[PDB]
Amino acid sequence: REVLTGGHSVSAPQENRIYVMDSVFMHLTESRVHVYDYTNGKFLGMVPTAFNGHVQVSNDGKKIYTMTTYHERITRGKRSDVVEVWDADKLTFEKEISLPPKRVQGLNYDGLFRQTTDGKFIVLQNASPATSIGIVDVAKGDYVEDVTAAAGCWSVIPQPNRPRSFMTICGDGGLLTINLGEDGKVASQSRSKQMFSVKDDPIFIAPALDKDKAHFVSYYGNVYSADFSGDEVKVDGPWSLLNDEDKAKNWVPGGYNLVGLHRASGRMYVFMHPDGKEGTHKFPAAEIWVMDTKTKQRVARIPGRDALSMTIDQQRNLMLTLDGGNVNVYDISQPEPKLLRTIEGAAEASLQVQFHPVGG
């Protein structure tokens, strides 16, 4: 006689798992994270995230963090903005952390919900609509700092070469760097020189992030860089993604989470489309271009499969791309990406996919 049981763990190893953040925009109060095995396309489980959830996996791979909004009666009653800590293997709720009722509600750019390199602090974007960066102490389960210095800035770019440092893009076209102390409070800060012209060459917020520098692409196909090998960030650019032939056909970048970097080679991946003009910066990819950031030249180009967002796994040399509903898996161990498979119907309305971390 068979017996139904609960309490089970996800059936595939952590190193196989990816996380597709489904906004379910048509029914945005029932957003969720779908967990998939990228090796075979199998659905592994899910985490419910209420109204416009955001998600990330802890750097140590043990927990899933979500950020969401509740009201007592959904469309009326008192608001509660929270971070939730979930077990990564059991996909169960463990802890709620209260936030002030101003967490960013918006589509799932990576930089709206991040963590420090040492994993001890969650770093999230607020908008009331005045902007600030909120700091959650994971060990304490508390919102510990509100970085009002980041007013007029947007999004969080962690520095992988420091334990508790991150940058944000400001309305002056520069970057603000925040270094947190071991208590999560601001220990120091600095502002770069202007990197880009906000009016004349706006950048996409999505970084192509290396260990000690970040690259950004612009609405017109230029590349800017921020070097944070030192305490002061040094900024440079532009160089153009485009050669003369590319310009003739008006190629420009487009998408959401639209770039990525393969750190061992310095290859940068960017979604591009032809016939660019004002208003096409979120168009699906006609192609993925592969750029050598050292030589500042393109090395390869492949079909884009109408993708809008991507992410990279360094240690397995993989790139995922995502068109809103379907996830494509690519091998990027060599300069030309090779399509391995497509996972159809991974989401109804997703613009963000992430790997389970394996680095520890």
């Binding site: 068979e2 139904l4 059991k90 996909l91 169960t92």
Partner: protein, 109 residues
């Protein structure tokens, strides 16, 4: 074959098959809780030609799985025969009544 609505054990499933949802025919996906109560189907086994009682326990406390939706009604009856009835939420008495998916648990002949 177990992920198909026409699999013999699924003859009175109205819901999403848990085997498509990170669980199996008889286990809930991670972080969803079995319902203690269930509707019952009597399903024909195409191998031995005998009918078997299948207990359809819902998995509860997570939002709709959305995969492998089935609506099969072999020997299903209205709510005045309540435990043969599948147009209700068999998670109705769980700590959280949100319905995630349905299992197909073989009881016996």
């Amino acid at each position: 074959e177990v992920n198909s609505c026409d699999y013999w054990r699924h003859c009175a499933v109205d819901g999403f098959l848990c085997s498509c949802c990170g669980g199996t025919t008889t286990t809930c996906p991670p972080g969803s809780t079995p319902s203690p109560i269930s509707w019952i189907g009597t399903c024909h086994n195409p191998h031995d030609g005998k009918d078997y009682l299948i207990s359809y326990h819902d998995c509860c406390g997570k939002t709709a799985c959305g995969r492998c939706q089935c609506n099969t009604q072999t020997r299903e009856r209205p709510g005045y025969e309540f435990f043969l009835h599948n147009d209700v939420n068999w998670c109705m008495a769980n700590e959280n009544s949100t319905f995630h998916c349905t299992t197909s648990v073989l009881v016996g002949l």
